[PDB]
Amino acid sequence: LPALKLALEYIVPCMNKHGICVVDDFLGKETGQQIGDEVRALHDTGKFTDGQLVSQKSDSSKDIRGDKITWIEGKEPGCETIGLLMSSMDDLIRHCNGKLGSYKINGRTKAMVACYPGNGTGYVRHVDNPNGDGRCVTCIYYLNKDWDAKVSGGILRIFPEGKAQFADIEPKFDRLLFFWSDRRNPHEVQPAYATRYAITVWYFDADERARAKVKY
Ligand SMILES: Cn1c(O)c(C(=O)NCC(=O)O)c(=O)c2ccccc21
Ligand SMILES: [Mn+2]
DSSP states (O other): OOSHHHIIIIIHHHHHHTSEEEESSSSOHHHHHHHHHHHHHHHHTTOSOSOOEEEOOSSTTSOEEOOEEEEEOSOSTTOHHHHHHHHHHHHHHHTTTTTSTTOOEEEEOOEEEEEEOSSSOOEEEEOSOSSOOSEEEEEEEEOBTTOOHHHHBOOEEEOOTTOSSOEEEOOBTTEEEEEEOSTTOOEEEOOBSSOEEEEEEEEEEHHHHHHHHHHO
16 A cells, blocks of 8 residues: 555554554565565664663573564665665654644654564563653554464563553554554553564654653
8 A cells, every 4th residue: 555545544543543553465476575674674784783681680591581682774784674664654654744743743753673582582571762852652563473472472462551452453464553652552562472573663753852851
């Protein structure tokens, strides 16, 4: 889908209504697999960190680490298609300009590529931007082919503010997710038992970010 039709007919009304929106088959199998290959190459050539220190034993051979990450600008060698994904995310957002809440998005972060190693680690419940750092929208692209949460876990569970229910999202291949980054969407990644990859970019609201400069 051109994604203008995507943005205008689905993403905009969905965000203003639910604040959590899912788009499947965003880029297609060929492009999605290319991104998957670049991501796995980054992993296989040691570009990710060793993983968030989850459990720190007196003996550090037994230390348990979780999510591994690496920041990608999109111009690095071997990251061209990730850069393409980023440009595609950017186009979609640009066409939503002035229609997502009363925000005015004027920038974004580099992409955070994350890898849950599949050792039973997940990510604790949290809010992406709880203190007004400028980020208004969280964008996540998933890379996991034939992901079966019943076997592999790794579900993203969102706890919509003021609602008594969960919003569970499987980290499926070629799936694109959008959600408000503030306290409206606390969320967690349930234990992942297989390697789980995702690429996240956060979009900035011009006003919030401008005043965050002094709040430092
Ligand atoms: C590795 N990783 C994350 O996976 C998520 C996150 O919420 N992920 C949700 C998901 O992958 O479905 C994060 O929000 C996050 C924030 C700071 C540093 C690392 C982080
Ligand atoms: Mn998060």
